[PDB]
Amino acid sequence: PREIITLQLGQCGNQIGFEFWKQLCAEHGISPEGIVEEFATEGTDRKDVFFYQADDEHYIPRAVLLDLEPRVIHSILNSPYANLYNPENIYLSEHGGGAGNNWASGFSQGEKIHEDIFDIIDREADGSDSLEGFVLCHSIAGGTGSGLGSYLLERLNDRYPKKLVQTYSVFPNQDEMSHVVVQPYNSLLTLKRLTQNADCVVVLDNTALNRIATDRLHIQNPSFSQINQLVSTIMSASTTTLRYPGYMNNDLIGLIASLIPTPRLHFLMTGYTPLTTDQSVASVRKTTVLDVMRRLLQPKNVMVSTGRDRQTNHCYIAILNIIQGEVDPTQVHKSLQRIRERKLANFIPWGPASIQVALSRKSPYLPSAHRVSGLMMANHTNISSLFERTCRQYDKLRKREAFLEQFRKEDIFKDNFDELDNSREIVQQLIDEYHA
Amino acid sequence: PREIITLQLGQCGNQIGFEFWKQLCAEHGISPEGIVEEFATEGTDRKDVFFYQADDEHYIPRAVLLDLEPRVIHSILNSPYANLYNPENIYLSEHGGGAGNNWASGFSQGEKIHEDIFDIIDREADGSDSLEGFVLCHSIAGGTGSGLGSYLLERLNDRYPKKLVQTYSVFPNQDEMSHVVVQPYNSLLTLKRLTQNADCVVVLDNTALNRIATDRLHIQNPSFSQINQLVSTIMSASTTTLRYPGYMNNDLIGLIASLIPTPRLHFLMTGYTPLTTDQSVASVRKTTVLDVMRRLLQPKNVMVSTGRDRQTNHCYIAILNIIQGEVDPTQVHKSLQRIRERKLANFIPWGPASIQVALSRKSPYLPSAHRVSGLMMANHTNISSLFERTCRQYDKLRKREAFLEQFRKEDIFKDNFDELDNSREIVQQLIDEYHA
Amino acid sequence: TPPTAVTEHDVNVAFQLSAHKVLLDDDNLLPLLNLTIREAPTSGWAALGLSYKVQWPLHILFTPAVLEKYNV
Amino acid sequence: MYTLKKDYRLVEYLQAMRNFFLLEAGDTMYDFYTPIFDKIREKEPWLNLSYLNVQIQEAVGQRYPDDSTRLSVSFESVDLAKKKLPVHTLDGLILSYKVPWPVDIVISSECQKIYNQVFLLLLLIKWAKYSLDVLQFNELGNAKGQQIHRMFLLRVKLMHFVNSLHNYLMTRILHSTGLEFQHQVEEAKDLDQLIKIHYRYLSTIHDRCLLREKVSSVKEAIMKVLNVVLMFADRWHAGLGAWKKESIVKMESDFTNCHKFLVKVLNKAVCRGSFPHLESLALSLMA
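The joint structure predicted for all components is written out below.
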């Protein structure tokens, strides 16, 4: 019916998808090894849209996880949520990889394991006779998720041409350049494949993570154990129309169709306010829906590093405001009434704009059926500031003679560096041209 | 009427048939030395189909047990189930055999005890004037069950030509080759007799036993005391239409006739899910028949070592799905409704396929009249992978000069090794040719 | 096609198998209705309907007039 | 019903005659049939009233279920009436179950006369399915050639149709009636209502088995398949020669041509309502 195959790949893409499947059992009322609660069918009306359909009421995840590093998968099998995963769909015990840290490693390893990489991931494709598409849950940081992920964006474009492609990709961190220095090279090589060899992306910045991780979360030493908490909730938040029973844009080709203006303009800004557990003691007094979307357009919950004074000459075109759970829908048109009076979104002068609001009932659970949740999927034309940030860090590195002799020994014979530079400037010029 | 004589033979064939008769008394409500329960006639409507018919309400087993090793029979008489066996039908006290470990030992011992081996086993033949047939409950492992069992497949083919032959033969283990090394020789010599001198077999792999013996059974040191538990239940499961009162395919020539496509293609895949005792506490809530056959075609309960990626070019032709006991037959056509939608069985493109389901009431017993049981008798054309495994281990051993001088001193004067090789490849070529 | 009288039964058993592969949470909620469709105007769409008949005394809340008002 | 349960054995008389000639029992009616069918295979007369009346004596005493063996000694269903015709058109065997008083007020002679004719067709695909069973065990009756595998291409097209026409069709008409007859036994209170639920029971047994005391297309689809089985078994009681295997694939191409011809007739008989022929078409599409 609407079966999606997630493509978890890389050192960071496997960990953000590990707790994504772990989030799904707590809201479906199911255990990874059994069914102890009856809340799975009376409370939740649809479960076989991301999981594989049941053979013994055991909803297998439709997931594949490949990585060169064996460290990310050795921290999985000792956890009690790995018995839900199957040891025959992806790998058996003692799976390995390369050495290995290179973008050209996984780019060259795709055609030497070409027979095996297109054998076991295609067995899940013909399980349903109407496949939705493929989401590449991969990474941009490092050479593991960026090297091999650029290969599958090409060969799955023609072997599966009538399928939706759209990824939840995480952006790397640009604070210092000591541990990694190959960051401007492997990022722009995948970013070219994300626009012409891929339809849509969902950007997730790393410098904007610790802006939120010290905002309300109150940590002193930033660890990697907090990167899975902001990411796994908004992943399950994006499929609330798709997993839980909704009516309009209840498919993944429903939501993405109403937000993309044009190809190579698909970078969607994400926002999510409620992350604090001591808000729970004051939501008993009928906290309404009239105050939760006034702060979405206000740049506080954003996960995109952008300029603060560059929003006057940029214009919103498509903005999504997803409320979940208890909505009190007699005032949801009242919340959309107050949008035109502030004009917090700059509107495009050539065409109409749209503020789309939708709702779906959440899990039968006490932290879910009590507190209001707001998921934002914006589309603003100030996203070229990240593309100006990455390009200015790209041409400055090529004048310092950095990784021009250390990178072209394997499988690179011609200069494909300006092939990425002009196509990035094509994106940056057509964005500002789009508001005439 | 429908009397079958079981031919228990060999070191492993005698132990798997010892608890097969021990399983039958617990379900007939009878004791091996007396009749203490009245549940034998009101609950069970037919008992004289594997047992000999009664003279004092003592249902004698129609069994013969010959082996060269006296160790398997000395662990029988101290058990309290041996008084049901007779000390005049097969042997009296202190029966012996050879030394002895050779395929040529029992092959040469068949014509020196030719007068006695065709004297006392024929006394049970004329007890009923309409004999069903002969099942050779023998072994392939070792030289004891494989050496003498190949002789009776020839001389009973013409002396009893109008009788059904079909065996529940166990396959040997191919993990290491240190204790036994004669395993590729004695197996292929009997496997030729199982196709042209025998109509049907029921394969039982040894490397697939410990796949199940550590799956749900949770053992650390694999012993031989677990090999009789998976085998004795599916033996009595295969005769539930024959022992208990059924209507269609209630004979052994009923079941085998509806599954064999052609001679030399008779290797049937077996499956049996319920083997766990803590499932009993949750079968009180009307566990249905709609979920028990979704996992039979799913390769989890199989007892055949086969390839996982070789099922796309292979096609099922005949599949049997036997439910037992409480069936709730108002939804058994509902279970067969869901078969065509998944197409978990690949169908032959030249002719029709068949998913046959049947039911029979189980024993009047509390672990039997409460928990659903599913017996599978499949027939899939991926069974040549075992024949490719045995043949590749056969021609590799003949190039190492192994057992060519140590095997042809007794009763072997010509090279009959390629007589087994071409006939095995005839089976492997006609299987792939069978789907045009 | 232009509609014919056998297309009523064919679209019916198609809605059967469609709601059945979905795995509704109630198997008997599925055959509680059938579907009905005009004679042959131009096309089958915008000429089809639904019959969900109703049991004991709930039918006094649902007269056979107003199920056409829901079906239209 | 207090007196019709403890004084008399009214429903036990009913379930015994359902075991007699609706074949809910075990191998009682099987072990009747295969001596008769082995007698057919050697061209010896099974009509022969007298020895046929004793092969059905040995049937009703088989399996010892204590609802029919005591009816074999007294109030026997053994008495069989035969009609012999030199024209050999509408030949008919008529078996009758002896039914006692006051059960005979419920069970009329015309009641068992139509429970007779459903056995005439139930034994007949029991004659047709088990012909394809033992002949498969007979295993290539000869034991340019090489036409045996192309013979096997269209043999199991018809071997499997007859095996599934008596497996899945029967197990849906035996369970659905046996579960709805047990409903009417759970209600059962008085004599005038027990007669009506038994008369509506046979008319269900009618509509279950095929339908139509008059002419329809489903009997023609039955009797065509019957001539396929008759030409099948007559072919295999001989050796296979050089051109004899060419006549098998010539007949079997025609036999699947009329089998597919009568499938496309069966779709029209299914979209004209809701029927147990809907289940027979769902069997035949899965075939």
